[PDB]
Amino acid sequence: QLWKWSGNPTQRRGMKKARKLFYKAIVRGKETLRIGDCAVFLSAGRPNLPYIGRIESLWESWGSNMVVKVKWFYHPEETKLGKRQSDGKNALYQSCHEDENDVQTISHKCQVVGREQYEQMMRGRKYQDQQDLYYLAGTYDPTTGRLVTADGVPVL
């Protein structure tokens, strides 16, 4: 019931300069999590719906501190605009705003696919409101507040 490293690491420096050992993947029993896969985390603050992010760099510092750098997704409720009318279920807005967190705060691996792929996948199972599959709806920048659709269309 914990996340452990998987595979040989590589030593490097910098990245807020000090020394660390960067790994490529973590494992929790049956579950695997490689760099590039999307993961739902364990959130507790004021953000509305669960934080979901893409892993960019896993490392361990001196003292066995497991740190994961995450590029954040954004639910429609977390933007400066509310859930757009007819936005869709399980919509995620891509962002290029990243930060570091603890590796053990990862709830479970998830998938982020296109809208048509999302609707083709979620066609049968009656238990639809899950937390394992989401669809990309566009790009959101928290610094500017601007957000565009999955086709490059800014909104108001």
CB 136 within 8 A of CB 112: yes
User: What domains can be seen in the chain, in order of their start residue?
Assistant: 4-148 (2.30.30.490)
Pick the closest to residue 133 from 42, 37, 28 (CA basis). Answer: 37
CB 35 within 8 A of CB 98: no
Resolution in units of Å: 3.3
In whole angstroms, give the CA distance from residue 98 to residue 143: 12
In whole angstroms, give the CA distance from residue 138 to residue 136: 6
CB 40 within 8 A of CB 32: no
Place of tokens 């790009």: 139
Bridge partner list, 134: 112
SS3 state of residue 103 = helix
What phi and psi values does residue 120 have, to the nearest 5 degrees?
Answer: -75, -35
Give CA 134 to chain center in angstroms.
11
* Pairing outcome for strands 4-6 and 19-23: unpaired
CB 112 within 8 A of CB 135: yes
Mark residue 88 as left, alpha or beta (left: phi above 0; alpha: psi -120 to 50; beta: remaining): left
* Pairing outcome for strands 133-140 and 91-102: parallel
Amino acid at position 74, single letter:
Y
Q: How far is CA 19 from CA 48, 92, 98, in A?
A: 35, 34, 20
CB 88 within 8 A of CB 68: no
Pick the closest to residue 110 from 46, 51, 69 (CA basis). Answer: 51
Pick the closest to residue 35 from 131, 133, 88, 103 (CA basis). Answer: 103
Q: How far is CA 9 from CA 6, 12, 59, 60, 146, in A?
A: 9, 10, 8, 9, 38
Helices (H), 10-72: none
The CA-CA-CA angle for residues 66, 23, 17, to 5°, reads: 70
Bridge partner list, 68: 58, 101
